[PDB]
Amino acid sequence: RYTLPVKAGEQRLLGELTGAACATLVAEIAERHAGPVVLIAPDMQNALRLHDEISQFTDQMVMNLADWETLPYDSFSPHQDIISSRLSTLYQLPTMQRGVLIVPVNTLMQRVCPHSFLHGHALVMKKGQRLSRDALRTQLDSAGYRHVDQVMEHGEYATRGALLDLFPMGSELPYRLDFFDDEIDSLRVFDVDSQRTLEEVEAINLLPAHEFPTDKAAIELFRSQWRDTFEVKRDPEHIYQQVSKGTLPAGIEYWQPLFFSEPLPPLFSYFPANTLLVNTGDLETSAERFQADTLARFENRGVDPMRPLLPPQSLWLRVDELFSELKNWPRVQLKTEHLPTKAANANLGFQKLPDLAVQAQQKAPLDALRKFLETFDGPVVFSVESEGRREALGELLARIKIAPQRIMRLDEASDRGRYLMIGAAEHGFVDTVRNLALICESDLLGERVARRRQDSRRTINPDTLIRNLAELHIGQPVVHLEHGVGRYAGMTTLEAGGITGEYLMLTYANDAKLYVPVSSLHLISRYAGGAEENAPLHKLGGDAWSRARQKAAEKVRDVAAELLDIYAQRAAKEGFAFKHDREQYQLFCDSFPFETTPDQAQAINAVLSDMCQPLAMDRLVCGDVGFGKTEVAMRAAFLAVDNHKQVAVLVPTTLLAQQHYDNFRDRFANWPVRIEMISRFRSAKEQTQILAEVAEGKIDILIGTHKLLQSDVKFKDLGLLIVDEEHRFGVRHKERIKAMRANVDILTLTATPIPRTLNMAMSGMRDLSIIATPPARRLAVKTFVREYDSMVVREAILREILRGGQVYYLYNDVENIQKAAERLAELVPEARIAIGHGQMRERELERVMNDFHHQRFNVLVCTTIIETGIDIPTANTIIIERADHFGLAQLHQLRGRVGRSHHQAYAWLLTPHPKAMTTDAQKRLEAIASLEDLGAGFALATHDLEIRGAGELLGEEQSGSMETIGFSLYMELLENAVDALKAGREPSLEDLTSQQTEVELRMPSLLPDDFIPDVNTRLSFYKRIASAKTENELEEIKVELIDRFGLLPDPARTLLDIARLRQQAQKLGIRKLEGNEKGGVIEFAEKNHVNPAWLIGLLQKQPQHYRLDGPTRLKFIQDLSERKTRIEWVRQFMRELEENAI
């Protein structure tokens, strides 16, 4: 139907086009191209957007050449994995026979190391190949593989017996080798997060750990070309200096030309004959733009003596000489615009389909679709993102009387047939040649846009990482109850009487080294006070830990009426169970005029399911700001009013109280639900009427400030309390509201908690929930740690006003707020300015927020009363003139005053002179500046904990260390209080030390350090030993150890059996055992199963071996010379016990 180019440089130009129709043409002309193809895109955000689409029409390999996704002259390291992937592309480019690679021109300019270099370096091992382990390991050093004890990414390797574990930088998956007798035995692959075997392969091509050589010759010739080109200093942070030390700079990846006498070959150098080049746009122009941009970086970053910059010629090709090599291959050019009728112009017959969106407000969203359909005369195929999309299609396809047949093959389509494909395509079209219509979701439901949070490989890790990184950092503070807190200082073995056991190093003041047995691992916890800057190294024998323990125990006395009444009703009373409605709740789901984010929908599920359980519910909704936190609350309130439990919500501010009242009255504009406020905006008689209605319970949702704490609100039936922004309340108030209603289902909301409350949040006495995945277009607000600067105020106010939004101006001084507004009004003549502070008439302030809410004035000279959670999405610039005396969480909440929409938010924080600034806001500003990313609400929270500290676990003063023992200690003091309230055990029955069973057989039993190098895995497995309660746990522990690790050590198998012995004794009474070379002593239990008659039979038949040791102990005299003999005697001994057990 058209012609391929054949000549080197031969063109086919295309016109009258649309978007992804181009990709269809690409797929077609690729199928009439026996060789491979390279598509070239204007941008990489296009390209993956492109990628799957051509995959949506591919039977060949759609391959993306992704890029480094960094700055031109960046200062960091790109994620290696896609690099490794690109390496595979580098590995698999001059070998290809069909399929396609895409590149952008900025990705086209990276001229890469030769495939000959790769091919010599990349190698292959085979299944039955004669190879020594350290020989291949030396080849891995040649590969520059990175020795990691617990390997996670490419070019990383771990030593474990005959097994050498490595994750290569070719494959998706890591490998196990297990050599034998100068021989490759195995080649066995697994998921590392599984850490367990998946499958065998008989071969590996291992690509070496970088694209770049870093060997001794590489380093030397680097130094050669470097001292040809750049200057060198004695400074150790010089790039030359670390590469001379053979280590890896962060921003080295631009300095890679230093390895080559030749200039770097382009990817075109890799190109075989059969390749194709496909253009879309004057990509020369984008290339020239990128040249200018990167050249701008070549001056801007080309001033640093500490990072010296190579020529941009020396990294990337120029546009004209580029096009000179572009002469060498035929190239098809693509233009949406129609072409003239010159030769080699195609203009193939495709139209953008006219818009057929859903018009739901009238009767017919679908009549445009209809009159489209009967004027059309061919197949209409529907791109469907998922099969879970498609029933939604059916949801509408029943409404047009017509439904398609699902297909996967485009050219099955025939006359007037309706068909569809699972595909995420952009837009519908009209095909003239085959007369084919196609329909997508973006044509129908408006912009079905997907907001890209991160790339495929790396992202912020809010779930796994903090769970993964929650113990055993070296030097981290870490607590032992006998002595206080110290810093972790490693793990070692020590010989202490023939038992070279494993003990942990803890450092105290005056370098006091404490070595701790692995059995006593449970006397060690993470320091719960944060205090990472400075934490108390209790000097050994200093008794301050003992004094604080006694003081806390005095506070932890079970006569404490602050919470022991709650624990008494916990031991005497119960709660309410909400019932769910499967039908009416869907109506209020459809009353929700947006789409729930995935991270908020699961929060709704966790809230509502915990409502539907009988205990007194208690959940925290600590999410990012403006993420629809109000929506979770209104869903919970809708379930509660479906049971009519008189919902009591509580915010610490009349302003956002009124704002949420407007939200409630607007959203709940259909149901017979009474939503009322008691606050200061209701008078002494209006609020009196409203509290009377509360006392009669006819109000279903009550909205109030700290007015609710005045002992005067009495619900006739209170079931649901919704706390919002608990960080300003005070635990006195949070228990004042709590002590009224016992079986209330408490709900707690914030954006950031108190570090004390944050600690009890992560330790899980109550529930936790983090919200991410922003709703539409929420953004990284630009933090401006700037000085107090009038011109900065000028540029900020003008740029916000030309943007169209409003300006915040925080002052926090009522005595000078009138003067500040008076000077600033003439200081910015183009501003509209009023005054806001909480020391004037509340209806006047109501007028002020009436004006600022309804956009009546732009700049607001205000105190920190704007930190009351006021929504106002139009505001996108905040100026804090004095950033001195404000906490960091408050700074983040003020950063949450701007944004909340698609328009960009600025955050100007004017400061005084940095010496006259503060002692603490220097830290606060470097925290608020370094933290601007998706998911930073809990990162700043984990800063807030350990900059201000967790307060007293029950009493006041939630900021400060407040003798922080740990919330884990609250468990033990609470359970001792439970013993106290058991009415038969006293507080003097304080079970502080409960080993609760102990056995000893006197062997060194350890995880060996040469066997287990990682102390983290070793301690974790020790915790597995401790947490082992059944033999099948032991079975799985041993098989995962043999799986991931191979050898089965003597002391390891011994201690496994010892844990089995403790399992037996717990199953079979036994309070205590002692064993030695000649025997030992057994200490029985009361509620036991020890056979007395069989036991005295044992006595009277071997009096030589046994004597009584008290009525509940027993000395046994046994020739326990061989360690195996000991093992057998105890094993069969408790077997004998288990046979005749009583």
Short mmCIF file of C-alpha atoms in Angstrom, two decimals, residues 142-340:
data_model
loop_
_atom_site.label_atom_id
_atom_site.label_comp_id
_atom_site.label_asym_id
_atom_site.label_seq_id
_atom_site.Cartn_x
_atom_site.Cartn_y
_atom_site.Cartn_z
CA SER A 142 37.70 -7.97 37.80
CA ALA A 143 33.99 -7.35 37.27
CA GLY A 144 34.21 -4.82 40.08
CA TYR A 145 31.42 -6.61 41.86
CA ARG A 146 30.57 -5.07 45.21
CA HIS A 147 30.94 -7.22 48.31
CA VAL A 148 27.69 -6.94 50.22
CA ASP A 149 26.81 -9.09 53.20
CA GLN A 150 23.12 -8.84 52.30
CA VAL A 151 22.90 -8.24 48.59
CA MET A 152 20.02 -6.27 47.10
CA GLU A 153 20.99 -4.97 43.63
CA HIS A 154 23.30 -5.52 40.68
CA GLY A 155 27.02 -6.25 40.92
CA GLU A 156 26.75 -7.29 44.56
CA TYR A 157 27.94 -10.55 46.00
CA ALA A 158 27.92 -12.54 49.21
CA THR A 159 30.20 -15.31 50.44
CA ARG A 160 28.48 -18.31 52.06
CA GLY A 161 30.34 -21.62 52.18
CA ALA A 162 30.78 -23.18 48.78
CA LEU A 163 27.87 -20.91 47.72
CA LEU A 164 28.72 -17.50 46.13
CA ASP A 165 25.49 -15.48 45.84
CA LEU A 166 25.37 -12.75 43.25
CA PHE A 167 22.85 -10.57 41.46
CA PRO A 168 24.27 -9.88 38.00
CA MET A 169 23.90 -6.74 36.03
CA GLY A 170 22.36 -8.51 33.12
CA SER A 171 19.48 -10.39 34.60
CA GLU A 172 16.32 -9.69 36.54
CA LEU A 173 17.30 -12.23 39.16
CA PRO A 174 20.24 -13.44 41.30
CA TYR A 175 22.14 -16.69 41.31
CA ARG A 176 23.60 -19.46 43.48
CA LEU A 177 26.68 -21.35 42.45
CA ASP A 178 27.80 -23.85 45.13
CA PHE A 179 31.13 -24.89 43.70
CA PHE A 180 32.72 -28.25 44.15
CA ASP A 181 36.21 -29.60 43.48
CA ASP A 182 37.16 -26.83 41.03
CA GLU A 183 33.78 -27.25 39.41
CA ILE A 184 30.52 -25.41 38.85
CA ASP A 185 27.95 -27.63 40.51
CA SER A 186 24.75 -25.62 40.65
CA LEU A 187 23.24 -22.52 39.09
CA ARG A 188 20.11 -21.72 41.05
CA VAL A 189 17.96 -18.59 41.23
CA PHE A 190 15.60 -17.09 43.76
CA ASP A 191 13.87 -13.93 44.88
CA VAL A 192 16.01 -12.10 47.41
CA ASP A 193 13.01 -10.82 49.34
CA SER A 194 11.87 -14.40 49.32
CA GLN A 195 15.54 -15.34 49.91
CA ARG A 196 14.43 -18.87 48.87
CA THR A 197 15.18 -20.93 45.72
CA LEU A 198 12.99 -20.43 42.66
CA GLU A 199 14.45 -22.34 39.74
CA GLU A 200 17.51 -23.86 38.13
CA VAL A 201 19.24 -22.66 34.98
CA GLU A 202 22.18 -24.41 33.36
CA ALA A 203 23.92 -21.25 32.18
CA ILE A 204 24.64 -17.61 32.96
CA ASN A 205 25.93 -14.76 30.96
CA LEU A 206 27.21 -12.51 33.75
CA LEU A 207 27.56 -8.89 32.76
CA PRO A 208 30.21 -7.20 34.91
CA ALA A 209 29.17 -4.90 37.70
CA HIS A 210 29.42 -1.60 35.80
CA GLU A 211 29.52 -0.31 32.28
CA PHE A 212 32.78 1.15 33.17
CA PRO A 213 36.16 -0.34 34.05
CA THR A 214 37.55 0.51 37.45
CA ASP A 215 40.52 -1.87 37.47
CA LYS A 216 44.10 -0.87 38.16
CA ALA A 217 44.84 -0.17 34.49
CA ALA A 218 41.53 1.68 34.23
CA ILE A 219 42.42 3.83 37.23
CA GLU A 220 45.90 4.52 35.89
CA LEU A 221 44.74 5.55 32.43
CA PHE A 222 41.99 7.60 34.04
CA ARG A 223 44.74 9.38 35.94
CA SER A 224 46.58 9.78 32.64
CA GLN A 225 43.71 11.44 30.77
CA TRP A 226 42.80 13.42 33.90
CA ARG A 227 46.22 14.94 34.31
CA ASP A 228 46.16 15.64 30.60
CA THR A 229 42.92 17.54 31.01
CA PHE A 230 42.02 18.77 34.51
CA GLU A 231 43.87 20.26 37.42
CA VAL A 232 44.50 18.26 40.60
CA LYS A 233 44.50 19.36 44.23
CA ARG A 234 45.65 17.88 47.52
CA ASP A 235 42.00 17.98 48.61
CA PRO A 236 40.75 14.45 49.37
CA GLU A 237 37.30 15.28 48.00
CA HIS A 238 38.82 15.67 44.52
CA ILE A 239 37.33 13.34 41.91
CA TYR A 240 40.82 12.32 40.83
CA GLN A 241 41.57 11.52 44.47
CA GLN A 242 38.77 9.05 45.10
CA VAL A 243 39.27 7.35 41.76
CA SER A 244 42.95 7.11 42.66
CA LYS A 245 41.64 5.52 45.85
CA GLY A 246 39.50 3.33 43.61
CA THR A 247 36.14 4.32 45.10
CA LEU A 248 33.02 5.59 43.40
CA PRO A 249 31.91 9.23 43.19
CA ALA A 250 28.24 10.10 43.18
CA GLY A 251 28.33 12.21 40.02
CA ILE A 252 31.03 10.20 38.27
CA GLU A 253 28.75 9.21 35.41
CA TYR A 254 29.47 12.30 33.40
CA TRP A 255 33.22 11.75 33.79
CA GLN A 256 33.10 8.36 32.10
CA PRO A 257 34.93 9.54 28.87
CA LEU A 258 38.15 9.40 30.93
CA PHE A 259 38.56 5.71 30.15
CA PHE A 260 39.17 5.83 26.44
CA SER A 261 41.88 7.01 24.10
CA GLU A 262 39.22 7.17 21.42
CA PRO A 263 36.21 9.44 21.64
CA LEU A 264 33.19 7.55 22.88
CA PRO A 265 31.46 5.62 20.09
CA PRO A 266 27.83 6.52 19.51
CA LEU A 267 25.05 3.99 19.61
CA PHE A 268 24.96 4.51 15.84
CA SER A 269 28.39 2.86 15.97
CA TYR A 270 26.54 -0.15 17.36
CA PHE A 271 24.01 0.03 14.53
CA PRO A 272 23.85 -2.88 12.07
CA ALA A 273 22.70 -2.49 8.49
CA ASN A 274 19.12 -3.70 8.95
CA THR A 275 18.20 -1.00 11.47
CA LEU A 276 15.51 1.63 10.91
CA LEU A 277 15.27 5.25 12.04
CA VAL A 278 11.89 6.88 12.66
CA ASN A 279 11.51 10.60 13.37
CA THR A 280 8.72 12.54 15.05
CA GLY A 281 9.35 16.28 15.00
CA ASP A 282 12.19 18.72 14.39
CA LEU A 283 14.12 16.81 16.99
CA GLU A 284 17.17 18.79 16.00
CA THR A 285 15.47 21.71 17.73
CA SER A 286 14.96 19.83 20.98
CA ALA A 287 18.56 18.68 20.69
CA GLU A 288 19.69 22.27 20.28
CA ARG A 289 17.61 23.22 23.33
CA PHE A 290 19.23 20.47 25.34
CA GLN A 291 22.63 21.57 24.09
CA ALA A 292 21.91 25.08 25.33
CA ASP A 293 20.56 23.82 28.65
CA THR A 294 23.43 21.47 29.27
CA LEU A 295 25.85 24.18 28.17
CA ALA A 296 24.23 26.49 30.71
CA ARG A 297 25.01 23.79 33.24
CA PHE A 298 28.52 23.73 31.78
CA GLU A 299 29.03 27.26 32.93
CA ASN A 300 26.93 27.05 36.12
CA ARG A 301 28.55 23.90 37.40
CA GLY A 302 31.77 24.73 35.54
CA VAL A 303 32.86 27.02 38.34
CA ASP A 304 33.32 24.27 40.91
CA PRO A 305 36.95 23.42 41.68
CA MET A 306 35.61 20.31 43.40
CA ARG A 307 33.76 18.82 40.41
CA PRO A 308 35.46 19.66 37.10
CA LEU A 309 33.51 19.40 33.90
CA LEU A 310 34.41 17.66 30.68
CA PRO A 311 33.56 19.16 27.28
CA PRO A 312 29.94 18.66 26.19
CA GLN A 313 31.44 17.79 22.83
CA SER A 314 33.43 15.15 24.67
CA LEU A 315 30.22 13.66 26.01
CA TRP A 316 27.64 14.32 23.36
CA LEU A 317 27.51 14.81 19.63
CA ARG A 318 26.43 18.02 17.98
CA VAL A 319 23.30 18.41 15.92
CA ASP A 320 24.84 19.06 12.51
CA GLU A 321 27.47 16.34 12.73
CA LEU A 322 24.73 14.19 14.24
CA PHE A 323 22.65 14.68 11.12
CA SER A 324 25.75 13.86 9.09
CA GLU A 325 25.72 10.40 10.62
CA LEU A 326 21.94 10.44 10.23
CA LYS A 327 22.73 10.41 6.50
CA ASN A 328 23.81 6.80 6.89
CA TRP A 329 20.46 5.19 7.48
CA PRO A 330 17.02 5.48 5.92
CA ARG A 331 14.62 7.34 8.13
CA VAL A 332 10.89 7.77 8.06
CA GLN A 333 9.69 11.14 9.33
CA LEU A 334 6.36 11.71 11.06
CA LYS A 335 4.31 14.91 11.05
CA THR A 336 0.81 15.39 12.40
CA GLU A 337 0.59 18.30 9.95
CA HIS A 338 -0.40 17.51 6.38
CA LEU A 339 2.37 17.48 3.78
CA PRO A 340 2.66 19.09 0.35
#
